[PDB]
Amino acid sequence: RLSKIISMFQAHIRGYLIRKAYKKLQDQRIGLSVIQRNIRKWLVLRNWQWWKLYSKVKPL
C-alpha cells in the first residue's frame, strides 16, 4: 500500500514540473515561430531579383 501511495506522490510531483514548463513552452512557440517566419522572409528576399539588383548598387 505504501509504495502505491509513494507513486501518486511521484505523480503529483511529475504533474507539478509539466505545468511549470507549460508556461515556458507556450512562449518559446511564439519565439520559435517568430525566428522561423522571419528567416523564411529573408531567404525569400535575397532570391528576388529586385533585391539582388539593389544589393549590388548598395556600395556604388
Partner 1 sequence: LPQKQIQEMKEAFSMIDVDRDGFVSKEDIKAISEQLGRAPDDKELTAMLKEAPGPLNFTMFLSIFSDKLSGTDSEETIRNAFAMFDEQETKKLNIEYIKDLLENMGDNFNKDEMRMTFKEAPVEGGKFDYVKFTAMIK
Partner 2 sequence: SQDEIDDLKDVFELFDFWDGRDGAVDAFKLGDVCRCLGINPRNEDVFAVGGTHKMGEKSLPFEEFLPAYEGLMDCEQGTFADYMEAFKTFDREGQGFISGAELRHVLTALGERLSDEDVDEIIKLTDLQEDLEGNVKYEDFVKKVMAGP
Per CB under 8 A, which of residues 18..57 are in contact with partner 2? 18-20, 22, 25-26, 29, 32-33
**Interaction partner, residue 59 (partner 1, partner 2, none; CB < 5-8 Å by kind):** none
**Interaction partner, residue 43 (partner 1, partner 2, none; CB < 5-8 Å by kind):** partner 1
DSSP string, the chain: -HHHHHHHHHHHHHHHHHHHHHHHHHHHHHHHHHHHHHHHHHHHHTTSHHHHHHHHHTT-
Contact yes or no for 51/45 (Cβ under 8 A) = yes
CB of 14 to partner 2, least distance (A): 7
Interaction of residue 29 with partner 1, rule CB under 8 A: yes
